[PDB]
Symmetry: D2
């Protein structure tokens, strides 16, 4: 079932959230938030800058002090607070899904059934880890008792993207809080609204003040203050590889803060001749077109064995011609707008390069509508490796389909990129499934599927698609700092 | 027993090591290597620069290719090769300890009994992990089989310091090789010799070509080529916090390579009134003066409770006046030289600041001898927190002793530094031992001891003393890259 | 705050629970359930026997079949069902605490504040593990892909004691269900009632039918049917060491089912001269007298250093004379009855042996009241090692206090028992705390405390106090069965 | 290459090994050891009985005492001793392989290339774990510091089978010693000799006295003394399911010692129509006929899809007719004798049942030669599920081949046994490989292979094929005993 909000959405939370209270910006300035489907202003939000980030860090630092409620409470109680927060997001699911759709240009069906479900499920997963984070006792050489503490790191600056505002907010704060950190969150300038509603729920759930602080504002100002801050211990960022480089540089230049990055991709699929063809067509299609192509895992290079290539292209094109564009709140609509002008312009520019560089336009290839940042769903066949559409992350509804005849070569071509977020392998051959997935230089390899993401799995990039992993058991390591304690004793025994 | 080499040391290995063969530098240039005890040139070594680092990376990359001997061999066989290398270092222990002492200005007794023992033991520990590096199978939501591979990362650039050339070489290459990486090692410009001997043993042990490549040369040239290299996947560096910042910046600027850093410290000890006094005096003394103070963990701020402060200072000063300075090869000598002019000048400058800023000079405080970079063992009492000798890493035989009356305050003072490598707590109180060690912002906290390092423990800094951990179970994580493989199935069962 | 049930308790659930429905016994027989405070019959309950256990196993086996809802549901959803069950127990906390107090002779204050809190907390802990149970991927020798599945074992027969009916029900079913097993629970003949209420909540929460089956009845009939059953995969039992031996024998004789046992103890405390005396007196007192002494961890031998022995005995005796005996539902009452006649008779017999064998009776030593199985709180000093009260588990409010002068000897005396459930060490000496706790042959050693139990810790006996551990990360291993899957491939890569 | 011993084998070690010295039996009795290929007596060996087991346990107990060399030595040094033992077995490989072949009736080629290689490799694997056995630090509720120690269990009685004397000796002692236990080993009455040679190497390697004690003798006497012993903490047994039941009973009856069992099987293979046929034929053939069929994993029921059944039977029969029977020391011989008369008689009896119950004899079916316990390699087709040869472990060179048409049904038939050691699945279908292996109730499932065993994998049975696992990370758990230490503190921090 797909239920809907019965009254119109009223925007309430538009301020900076520090020590569980609502703050005007230090400057007093505010910035507009827009609906990408209408190009109309929804509201104004307080514009946080370096001075506001500074207030947030002081609050996070104080909440992190030895003897504070957040440091001293039972790990099980940090878990309890996270599960309570998940219950509250579940209570406000209609409200949050509507706001997410309206602000983010995100199909409401997906916002409600996928984004909100994933947000609730990830929080509950993270809640479960809280009192299961454990160090070791270690049989060191000599007469010593050695143990380790897996402590929280401290204050964690977290910069959230616009493409999955709620999901990414929870992917950041869930593990950080489960491990006992305090956070300073900087939601995307395009999509601050749902994060600020979640802040109200953090207060309601009973988190101690300063444990979660949310400073909306811009990248170059608030994001650059977080990255260069001398008392932020760690920064996590999801976004473009370009900005990831600048984050990593500012961390090294300032206080050597720990850095994790989830960045873009140019993720390949390899479709062997023996693949289940309609399954491969459907998953590759959804793999590239999901959320108007605005996924870092977008399956933006599809390599198909020559003998099934024409049939793959044909089936793919017919699937791509079945969309209904429009406002993402209207039922039956199956493709919303792109997030803003900058992204819209980038996508159209890259579509034009595909045309100019000699790719075969199968469908789409231009804008749509009288308002909103809409781009027609586009398919290119006969794509070659030095084309811009084969090398650059488009972040739009633009599919590239390529042929191959040699498996050795297509693996090289798949790996011949500075990216490495994910990949897809489609085959009925057991040996090929295992050997190809082993050889691909990508963080997640899907076999006979694509875009399957769950809280129980680690997720992140090889190469310039990122540093570190999120979620799973393994992701939690990056929100702890290991302390070794070695105690002199008279005599040890095994 | 302390055995010695029966014939004089002959230097054999002075060339760049790539694909298990000895290479002249591309330029043809060579650089001098000196003995810090005599200031005399021992030999010339080939000067590697960006062009040589480029050759080494290509060799490491080729050895890392899917289907290569190093990728395809049993994990147990990578372990076997490491244990064989440890056996060979054990065979050449006299030779290596002598060379280490001669080149590094390191007391031979310590070089033989500690450095070489630690080198052999760490390698054997690392060898044991090789076929115990494991991913997971994960009960993901939905009908999927999900597993993870903990793969080697790939080509790892490793920059080794001059203070423990052999130990640090093994701390880098042992875990990297155990996990299946290939390496490009850049030993310190001051101490290339023992690394090049180990390279000959890597060949003898039977490691495939290109798995370990060693390029001697300078920091600004060879180190900056490694840090900015577009096909190096990871960089590990031990050294000054200053250079660590530049490494982290160059990694972000170039290819977002993974970075681990073990950097300096200003490590504190807290000595409570109830402490075993002579134990605390002895460990704090060795904690600061070991290897002419040239340890990143140097216990360079010693806080002592007021009532035992005078007695602690008295006992410490008498311990510090018992050294015999001279050539580190002569038996009975108990303090060698500093490594070079740059470090020598820095130490004397900081000693002069202590005098000028009003610290109480208890002993030492000047140079020694007619040749060699010797500094008298120096003790300052009545040190205050804004003195240069309390804030800056000296990296010399210079002890600082401070008084405290409040435990709350001394913990704040201990933590009031951008460093955080290690710390010492001396007390008979169980509760104090546990609570103080928990509250200290340091990677290793010793209780009633100091400088106890073993292969089974993770080791590394909080804050600007580093990123990541070395050794232990936990250290091995940073030499793997996690890949998630998610396979569509018809029906899963628990 | 201590809230109470506003109306009188009405007993509703008195039947056998199979496939989420209420069953009469196959024979049609029923057995009486009593209140140990009044000796009055509360109700009748259906008497399950081998024929009913057989029906329960068939139901558990069917729920465990490949393709069943319980096998195929997301691990996260097994977790969700457990957290929902915890919410329901929390909703019915007053009801359950009252029933537990009334049926079990358990102080209501403790039943509400401790037992019910522990029950809710343990379930929530277990819920968190459900989708965090993971196998491995393993770098086996040769060209193979090897992974492991940590599968549920299957049908688990679980025999629950009368002393903590609710807590022990949850300690059994929580981990078993989290791991994906199905269960056949056999609550104590004395205390079936709270388990049957929880069964109604298992139905309400939405667990699939047959996942949890509860067969009340006697030990020799229903317990012996479970232990000897040919299609029960595992048996877990908490109870006397005597019956544990019979369970282990019947498992070996029948189908080699896996066995875990948590059995009795004769747990020692060692109180050194430097101990915080009133802390040691208070914890040792609570350690032996908690729940009328009916805890397997009862601190039933207290060894005190000679110089503080007289003062320890004095303070202990005055603490023991402060109880108010009576109905465990009346506020202000601080000691309830023993569970039944058999236990009552055993306790009085052992008290008489202490008198006859020459122990010094400090207080108590006889029965109390006109009805209920009440025993005066009793303290013996000058206890020696060959007395019955020093060797045999009393399971009653009977404290034994002994002197020692040698630490070597008292450790030997502490370890000189076939039991080994737990122990207590009281000292201010760091070295003694670590070395004594290492040397004691006991599963849980408390330092400067006693009886501190939490869901995050493994718990179980050394020697004849048990096989296996419950709770913690480690406890979950015993509710999985490891399957290795090794797949031939053409070429492996690291 | 296959090198051979240059002089004839001389038997040296024939005595009981206690405290690293050679002991006559207490009775003075000795028992004969035979060559199964000639039926000739090789030597006499001291017959250990309960009195000798008692001496061994006292020695093991003393070596296990707190403060002993084995308890106090570095974990890394226990590892060193194991790697040294592996080096010594490698030195004596020719000698040991020859003795193993001669005493065990085991093909020399296999004894040298497989058994000895596996023995050396498993020891080296186990050596690596020694200083990697670690407990935890745990964020318990309340103000406590909680850690766990993964201690050795203590004295471990280990009963070794005759089919792989050396491999099984090492599978037992390697993990037990790595974890810090002491052992009392009881090699098979048929094959004591190689174990006693290894005992001499344990002395040479420098293991402390009493750490390894070896008591040769019979099952009903020495094995029953170990199983019922009141001061043996754990028993591990590999052998028949029949004796496993008696071990488990005697453990429960005596001191509740921990029990692990690796018992027989009736392991199935499922060969789907799409399988690589010659690969499936070859692996299934080796799966049943390896070491004269005397493997607990013997692939003794082969289910083949109807359409390829006739061709599978044909190819299997031709493979089975290619053996050369004779003395296992003669090169070119490819099938040795069975171990003794009891096993020989059992095999022939079961072959006769196959004939009488209506199975189709394809080849073999009788004895061979004038001396030695030789049985012709035998193949039965058209085997049905209620035949003795389909239900009972034969432990001989006797292959059973069955047809199936339904996959649902053949899985039920495969699982319809009280055994569950291992299984084989042969298919090219990815989904079938994963789903069938998940559904099979067996400890190891091989996919497109069979009998692939390595030290890095856990190994053991489901159901009546065993309790617990050996080797791998998971196997090491069963040689530790977990102790929780919970320390009261003033205030905890995360
Ligand atoms: C909503 C999903 S995430 C998710 N689902 C997707 C994508 C493309 N197609 N689909 C169906 C995608 O790119 N993400 C995503 C991945 C990483 C970071 C952010 C978003 C989820 C699932 C389980 C738990 C939480 C979130
Ligand atoms: C030689 C030791 S390391 C070692 N031993 C020391 C130090 C100061 N006093 N002492 C006795 C010290 O700073 N290091 C060290 C620590 C980290 C990196 C490099 C060196 C060792 C021990 C065990 C295994 C390997 C190496
Ligand atoms: Cl993982
Ligand atoms: Cl750790
Ligand atoms: Cl544990
Ligand atoms: Cl495992
Ligand atoms: Yb299909
Ligand atoms: Yb427009
Ligand atoms: Yb002392
Ligand atoms: Yb000079
Ligand atoms: Yb006190
Ligand atoms: Yb009575
Ligand atoms: Yb083939
Ligand atoms: Yb014969």
């Amino acid at each position: 079932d797909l239920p809907v909000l019965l009254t119109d959405l009223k925007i309430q939370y538009t301020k900076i959230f520090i020590n569980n209270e609502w703050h005007d910006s230090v400057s007093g300035k505010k910035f507009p938030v827009f609906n990408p489907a209408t190009e109309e202003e929804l509201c104004q939000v307080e514009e946080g800058d370096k001075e506001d980030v500074d207030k947030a860090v002081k609050a996070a630092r104080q909440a992190f002090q030895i003897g504070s409620p957040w440091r001293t409470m039972d790990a099980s109680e940090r878990g309890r607070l996270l599960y309570k927060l998940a219950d509250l997001i579940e209570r406000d699911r209609l409200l949050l899904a509507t706001m997410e759709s309206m602000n983010g240009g995100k199909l409401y069906s997906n916002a409600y059934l996928s984004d909100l479900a994933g947000c609730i499920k990830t929080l509950r997963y993270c809640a479960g880890w809280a009192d299961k984070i454990q160090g070791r006792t270690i049989p060191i050489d000599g007469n010593f008792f050695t143990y380790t503490r897996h402590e929280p790191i401290g204050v964690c600056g977290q910069i959230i993207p616009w493409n999955f505002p709620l999901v990414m907010l929870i992917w950041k704060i869930g593990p950080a809080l489960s491990c006992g950190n305090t956070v300073v969150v900087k939601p995307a300038e395009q999509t601050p609204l749902t994060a600020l509603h979640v802040a109200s729920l953090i207060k309601e759930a009973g988190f101690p003040p300063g444990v979660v602080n949310i400073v909306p504002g811009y990248g170059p100002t608030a994001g650059a203050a977080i990255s260069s801050h001398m008392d932020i211990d760690k920064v996590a960022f999801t976004g473009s590889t370009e900005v990831g480089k600048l984050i990593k540089e500012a961390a090294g230049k300032s206080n050597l803060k720990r850095v994790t990055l989830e960045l873009g991709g140019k993720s390949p699929c390899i479709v062997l001749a023996d693949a289940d063809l309609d399954n491969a067509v459907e998953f590759a299609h959804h793999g590239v077109f999901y959320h108007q192509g605005q996924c870092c895992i977008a399956a933006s290079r599809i390599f198909v064995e020559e003998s099934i290539y024409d049939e793959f292209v044909r089936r793919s094109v017919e699937r791509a011609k079945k969309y209904i564009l429009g406002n993402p709140l209207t039922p039956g609509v199956t493709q919303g707008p792109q997030i803003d002008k900058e992204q819209y312009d980038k996508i159209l520019d890259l579509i034009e390069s595909g045309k100019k560089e000699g790719a075969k336009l199968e469908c789409g290839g231009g804008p749509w509508g009288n308002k909103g940042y809409f781009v027609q769903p586009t398919v290119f066949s006969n794509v070659t490796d030095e084309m811009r559409i084969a090398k650059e992350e488009i972040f739009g509804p633009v599919q590239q389909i390529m042929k191959f005849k040699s498996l050795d070569d297509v693996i090289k071509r798949a790996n011949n990129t500075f990216y490495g977020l994910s990949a897809g392998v489609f085959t009925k051959d057991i040996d090929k499934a295992i050997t190809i997935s082993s050889a691909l230089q990508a963080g997640t390899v899907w076999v006979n599927c694509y875009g399957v993401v769950s809280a129980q799995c680690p997720f992140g990039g090889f190469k310039m698609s990122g540093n570190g992993r999120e979620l799973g058991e393994y992701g939690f390591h990056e929100y702890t700092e290991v302390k070794t304690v070695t105690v002199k004793i008279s005599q040890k025994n095994s």
